[PDB]
Swiss-Prot record, chain A:
Taxonomic lineage of the native organism: Eukaryota, Fungi, Dikarya, Ascomycota, Saccharomycotina
Record-linked PANTHER family: 60S RIBOSOMAL PROTEIN L3-RELATED (PTHR11363), LARGE RIBOSOMAL SUBUNIT PROTEIN UL3 (PTHR11363:SF5)
GO BP terms: cytoplasmic translation; maintenance of translational fidelity; ribosomal large subunit assembly; rRNA processing; translation; translational elongation
Protein name per Swiss-Prot or TrEMBL: Large ribosomal subunit protein uL3
Signal peptide (from-to): none
Localization terms from the record: Cytoplasm
UniProt organism field: Saccharomyces cerevisiae (strain ATCC 204508 / S288c) (Baker's yeast)
Cellular compartments per GO CC: cytoplasm; cytosol; cytosolic large ribosomal subunit
Curated annotation (Swiss-Prot), chain B:
Taxonomic placement: Eukaryota, Fungi, Dikarya, Ascomycota, Saccharomycotina
Phosphoserine PTM sites in chain numbering: S7
Whole-protein coverage range: 1 to 65 of 155
Family, per entry: Belongs to the eukaryotic ribosomal protein eL24 family.
Cell compartment(s), UniProt: Cytoplasm
Transmembrane parts of this sequence: none
Subunit annotation: Component of the large ribosomal subunit (LSU). Mature yeast ribosomes consist of a small (40S) and a large (60S) subunit. The 40S small subunit contains 1 molecule of ribosomal RNA (18S rRNA) and 33 different proteins (encoded by 57 genes). The large 60S subunit contains 3 rRNA molecules (25S, 5.8S and 5S rRNA) and 46 different proteins (encoded by 81 genes).
Name used for this protein in its record: Large ribosomal subunit protein eL24A
Additional detail: Present with 247000 molecules/cell in log phase SD medium. There are 2 genes for eL24 in yeast.
Function: Component of the ribosome, a large ribonucleoprotein complex responsible for the synthesis of proteins in the cell. The small ribosomal subunit (SSU) binds messenger RNAs (mRNAs) and translates the encoded message by selecting cognate aminoacyl-transfer RNA (tRNA) molecules. The large subunit (LSU) contains the ribosomal catalytic site termed the peptidyl transferase center (PTC), which catalyzes the formation of peptide bonds, thereby polymerizing the amino acids delivered by tRNAs into a polypeptide chain.
Organism, as annotated: Saccharomyces cerevisiae (strain ATCC 204508 / S288c)
Curated annotation (Swiss-Prot), chain C:
CDD domains, per the entry: Ribosomal_uL14
Name of the featured protein: Large ribosomal subunit protein uL14A
GO molecular function, one term: structural constituent of ribosome
List of residues that carry N-acetylserine: S1
N6,N6-dimethyllysine modifications at: K105, K109
Subcellular location: Cytoplasm
Domain of life: Eukaryota
SUPFAM superfamilies per the UniProt record, alphabetical: Ribosomal protein L14
Ribonucleoprotein among keywords: yes
Subunit and interaction comment: Component of the large ribosomal subunit (LSU). Mature yeast ribosomes consist of a small (40S) and a large (60S) subunit. The 40S small subunit contains 1 molecule of ribosomal RNA (18S rRNA) and 33 different proteins (encoded by 57 genes). The large 60S subunit contains 3 rRNA molecules (25S, 5.8S and 5S rRNA) and 46 different proteins (encoded by 81 genes).
Length: 386, 65, 136
RNA sequence: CAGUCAAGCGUUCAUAGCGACAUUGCUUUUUGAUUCUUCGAUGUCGGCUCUUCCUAUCAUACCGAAGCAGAAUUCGGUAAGCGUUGGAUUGUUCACCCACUAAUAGGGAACGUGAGCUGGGUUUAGACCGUCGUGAGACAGGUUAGUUUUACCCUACUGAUGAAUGUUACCGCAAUAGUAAUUGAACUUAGUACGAGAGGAACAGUUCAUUCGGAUAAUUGGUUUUUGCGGCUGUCUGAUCAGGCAUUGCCGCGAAGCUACCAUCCGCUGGAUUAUGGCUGAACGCCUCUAAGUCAGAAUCCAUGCUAGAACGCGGUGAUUUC
RNA sequence: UCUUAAGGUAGCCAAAUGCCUCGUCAUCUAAUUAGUGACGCGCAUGAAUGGAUUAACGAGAUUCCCACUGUCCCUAUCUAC
RNA sequence: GAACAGCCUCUAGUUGAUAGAAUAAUGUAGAUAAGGGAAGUCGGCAAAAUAGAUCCGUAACUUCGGGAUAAGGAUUGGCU
């Protein structure tokens, strides 16, 4: 017989399987559609999620009850030191999809980017791209040929880049290597751009501009094996339930004589690849700049890093992006910032955002002070400060 | 934005932090955090709580004012 | 509600499910208001219709004047006591949950309100703010 | 449950909406008839939980018709994409009220679902009553009390490894499979169109909700074995200190971690179509949206994106063992 | 006056006894097949097959109210094994 | 401490119950929880709240014995 009372199904069947992602670093499954008229531009950047903080800004929404009024908003800080271009990839389109015909690398490769190719780096002869470097060191001995191949073929061109893990305060020393598609001009122009930027370091401001609506692609936080009650948000069984209550009671009918794929079951929760769209860039801050967290209303010489540093992460001594809201992934995790795949107006994407105040109080508890100057101003002299 | 003071502890309350409480007599008590909010609900005296701005003022501590 | 409520309301942390008894803050002769339903509530299996500040609910008078007792009347919640967040980032709560008897149009039955009245309720219901003492 | 005919009803007018006398069917969701399977046993009522399916569509999308001026309605088409609740009484299915709602449509899946639960009912043994019986006892009559067992196997499902594709590492492609968003209100249009008045809309725009989903922990709330700091009782260490024990001794605060429509963020836009309305235009010199051809067009479909990656689908690239 | 002698008295009642039946009226609730109070041609109540009542008592059955709460809205977290 | 229960300690006795590592789900046992407060459910099942002592105060009904710790209020340490 039918369900006695209708209720919506628990979970989303389009996010299946709820398995562990293939790696820490989530790849861009699709890049923005190419337009030849626009200049050659990177469509993505790589950052490391440092933490969240608070901003206060004057909202400009003509018709909301909070029009021209201060609003407090959560933001995510992504530490984005400039990424190095090392190599490019050309994709020829075939009746079976895009196929990479060749990959040309740079002359010299960074130690972190070869640590990427290694696993037992210390017990290694570091023989990596040595014969490729020998193939290099001339004008076009074996490199202009590969570039000309990518120009003659390979309607899609992607540049191989890597992160500066050494700049970023983690303990990894192993750069993250990825591709970013060049989405402007001709294939020849894209190859020219890649050649010019070989071994060159691109900063986040060149690709991402303030008040942009971008996407974050990252692997969400892992939570191990989970029961169905939390993994799917099913109703808990009544208290007097023999053999357990954090379960799904009926996992199927008698017929079909199988458990269906759409029935909620226990297993891994989190550590999934996610692509979350329409996050507004609130600030693109420069690393070589004190008063990073200073705006036109606050004007205090303070940096984005909270008092005592970002929890579990550290400091933001590099360039950073402050995006509105939350993003997939946890702190210390590599995230990919991708340009929007469509032109969104929404009257809300177009909203120009001026930050009036950035929180820098300690996140390691209930911090009352933004700067050590303000802390000392409030608390005067301590016994330890003779 | 502006910085409010704790009605109990006398601490600076930056936007978002703490809570606001409206008593029955429509009096507003803004707390920097749950510590001061709980001490207030416990009918505790700020002048008798040692680390409170009111305590230091009553005891002539921090006479820099 | 509808043509009675003035504007729209930002979502307020729900604190008053069905079966809740709140104070009666007007002078209509009722002492408490028991919530039997909420206007504009969604439908979900095994989920109580809950109320918040400025919400119009259907209510009965469990304690008060017998002329008001034993019948279903609209009421408006004016104090919540469950902490909710404004867009300026502040979390605030009253000492008690309280509402006022009103007609479907939103016009109050009483002529005065004791205690403070929430800003969201005042914005939604001009007559409540008209008769209120302090608007927080 | 649906048709055919058409005496009549509908101020006139069979067919807007109905429709008698007759007659043709479909269905197996709210009954029988039969006795084919099961009596070396297929765990029975109802509810709870959860998934999926059907459409005879309650709501929502877009349409055609009206005895459609507007508003609200009513009759139909494509349509199951999406939803279809909260409660008082009853063990109830059913029922019947109170409400909210966009709506509170109907059904199936061994009358789905008991090694999923529960055990209120029925239907063991105790007991009471009424009627019946000489009696023992009977009573789909009432009442009260009455043990709900096992998974460690195979498969299915959910997640997790993994031999061999010379080795090893990195970056990718994308067959196939899944897919998701939903609904309402206020403002404005506008007290305008329409209407004698009473009444009273509809597109574009804005701000927000509802239901759902995926994340996140800046804030707020919650949790406390941080046994972190402090306080307290009894006792013990000879004594203000410093501690043990009280199965985490208790109380306040309590970071971090986890976590909440109890917090916050985010949830895309192109094409082909259905119904339908059209263009040109024969058949049938006229006419005709159709026959050839063709325009638009639904919450439909397929893409775009999103999730997985074929462990016997694939590509590119780096390095490949000096007595 | 008849059937086999009498012909249900006092009481009590939709009661653990009433089929129709979720009886009818009142009350209790926003709403009550529940509860209580009444009514009584009571299928089929009723007088030591004991009737009615009853303070106290009850791990007996039931209804409501206050208090209280994770039973629930709607779940989250912690400890030991 | 009212107390041969409850908690701790002297004499005496034992230190026995397969261990090591980690800290997923689901369990068993023990807890806590915003706002609401039985809306859950056959049904407040389970849990929570109450609780010792002193003082005050204590209803209907009653077989005058009770009901009664009715109900309902206040206090509680240490030191001199």
């Amino acid at each position: 017989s039918h369900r006695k009372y209708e209720a919506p199904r628990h979970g989303h069947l389009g996010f299946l399987p709820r398995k562990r992602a293939a790696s820490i670093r989530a790849r861009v499954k699709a890049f923005p559609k190419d337009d030849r008229s626009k200049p050659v531009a990177l469509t993505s950047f790589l950052g490391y999620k440092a933490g969240m903080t608070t901003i206060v800004r004057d909202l400009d929404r003509p018709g909301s009850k909070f029009h021209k009024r201060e609003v407090v908003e959560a933001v995510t800080v992504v530490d984005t030191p400039p990424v190095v271009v090392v190599g490019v990839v050309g994709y020829v389109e075939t009746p079976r999809g895009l196929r990479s015909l060749t990959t040309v690398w740079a002359e010299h490769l960074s130690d972190e980017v070869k640590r990427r190719f290694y696993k037992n780096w210390y017990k290694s002869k570091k023989k990596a791209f040595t014969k490729y470097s020998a193939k290099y060191a001339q004008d076009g001995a074996g490199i202009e040929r590969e570039l000309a191949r990518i120009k003659k073929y390979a309607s899609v061109v992607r540049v191989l880049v890597h992160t500066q893990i050494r700049k970023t305060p983690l303990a990894q020393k192993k750069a993250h290597l990825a591709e970013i598609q060049l989405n402007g001009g001709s294939i020849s122009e894209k190859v020219d751009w890649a050649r010019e930027h070989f071994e060159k370091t691109v900063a986040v401001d060149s690709v991402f501009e303030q008040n942009e609506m971008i996407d974050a692609i990252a692997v969400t936080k892992g939570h191990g094996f989970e029961g169905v009650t939390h993994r799917w948000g099913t109703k808990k069984l009544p208290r007097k339930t023999h053999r357990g209550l954090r379960k799904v009671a009926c996992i199927g009918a008698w017929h079909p004589a199988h458990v269906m794929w759409s029935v909620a079951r226990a297993g891994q929760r989190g550590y999934h690849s996610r692509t979350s769209i329409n996050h507004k860039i609130y600030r693109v801050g420069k690393g070589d700049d004190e008063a990073n967290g200073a705006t036109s209303f606050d004007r205090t010489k303070k940096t984005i890093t909270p008092m005592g540093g970002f929890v579990h992460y550290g400091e933001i001594k590099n360039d950073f992006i402050m995006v509105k809201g939350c993003i997939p992934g946890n702190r210390k995790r590599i995230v990919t910032l991708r340009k929007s795949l469509y032109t969104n107006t929404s009257r809300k994407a177009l909203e120009e955002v001026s930050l009036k105040w950035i929180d820098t109080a300690s996140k390691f508890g209930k911090g009352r002070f933004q700067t050590p100057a303000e802390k000392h101003a409030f608390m005067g002299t301590l016994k330890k400060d003779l | 934005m502006k910085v409010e003071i704790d009605s109990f502890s006398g601490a600076k309350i930056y936007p978002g932090r703490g809570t606001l409480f409206v008593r029955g007599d429509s009096k507003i008590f803004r707390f920097q955090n749950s510590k001061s909010a709980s001490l207030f609900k416990q009918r505790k005296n700020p002048r008798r709580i040692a680390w409170t701005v009111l305590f230091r003022k009553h005891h002539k501590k921090g006479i820099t004012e | 509600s509808g043509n009675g409520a003035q504007g729209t309301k930002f979502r307020i942390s729900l604190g008053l499910p069905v079966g809740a008894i709140m104070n009666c803050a007007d002078n209509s002769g009722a002492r408490n208001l028991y919530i039997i339903a909420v206007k504009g509530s969604g439908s979900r299996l095994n989920r109580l219709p809950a109320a918040s500040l400025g919400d119009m609910v259907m209510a009965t008078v469990k304690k008060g004047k017998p002329e008001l007792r034993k019948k279903v009347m609209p009421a408006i919640v004016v104090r919540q006591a469950k902490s909710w967040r404004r867009r300026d980032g502040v979390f605030l709560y009253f000492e008690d949950n309280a509402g006022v008897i009103a007609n479907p149009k939103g016009e109050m039955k009483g002529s005065a309100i004791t205690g403070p009245v929430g800003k969201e309720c005042a914005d939604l219901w001009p007559r409540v703010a008209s008769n209120s003492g302090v608007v927080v």
